């Protein structure tokens, strides 16, 4: 089997991407944030505290003839950005882009933090990291990908995120028309439950490439590119007037600037992030200070190749017995 679904930016900055997902019978379509940095599929639901729902589409298990309470199971998750959610668990039929999993754990939110409530466009998350990170207790549950894997033509999914445009998540096949040149594959460590890999270095603009190992995670659920302070300082030093602002919470730059590109290494290959991808616009409406898309990972504890990086590539998440990651230009 295979599946193919379009993923769409939630706003003009590509702050996140949503992908329609069919849950239950008859289908209830919710727009979920596919997140390769976590491993829970959770939704706004008829059980979500009413004051914490503000425009989201909800899953109502009682209206699904295939929903079954997973008795005794609860979940609770906290994300890197400080947001959180928790609740109980149903199993139900879940389809993405024509690919169907029966008996998928669908985690129904009873509570969500303010960041989720305030984002009316995201109806939940669909985690695509390794199932060892799944938070369901007392019986950990498998991700959608893990459940689908055996049925897939090939045990892979791909992320092809757009810049200010829709893109595609494919399951079970590599669309050879969706990228240019070749796909460069690189080793993955699953020790922390993430799609963790080591970039071979970076360049800023037309500058020379610096060969240096940068361990980080491929994370579709993180907006920005978080890298070591040394690397980030070297980038922003090439933008006149750029500075790190503790008050704003990172590097900002004059909105009048033209940003340089940023290149990262994948083995001997190179992925170029155009400067425009690094512009996250005015810090507040009407401001001439703009927020940078490359930020320090210091004090996150891990480097994160988020959407800023991934949307510059066609990315293969290979879930073979020995997982790997592939990157191609596009």
UniProtKB/Swiss-Prot annotation:
<feature type="disulfide bond">
    <location>
        <begin position="255"/>
        <end position="290"/>
    </location>
</feature>
<dbReference type="GO" id="GO:0004190">
    <property type="term" value="F:aspartic-type endopeptidase activity"/>
</dbReference>
<feature type="domain" description="Peptidase A1">
    <location>
        <begin position="17"/>
        <end position="328"/>
    </location>
</feature>
<feature type="active site">
    <location>
        <position position="35"/>
    </location>
</feature>
<keyword id="KW-0865">Zymogen</keyword>
<dbReference type="GO" id="GO:0006508">
    <property type="term" value="P:proteolysis"/>
</dbReference>
<protein>
    <recommendedName>
        <fullName>Endothiapepsin</fullName>
        <ecNumber>3.4.23.22</ecNumber>
    </recommendedName>
</protein>
<keyword id="KW-0732">Signal</keyword>
<feature type="active site">
    <location>
        <position position="199"/>
    </location>
</feature>
<keyword id="KW-0378">Hydrolase</keyword>
<keyword id="KW-1015">Disulfide bond</keyword>
<comment type="similarity">
    <text>Belongs to the peptidase A1 family.</text>
</comment>
<keyword id="KW-0645">Protease</keyword>
<keyword id="KW-0064">Aspartyl protease</keyword>
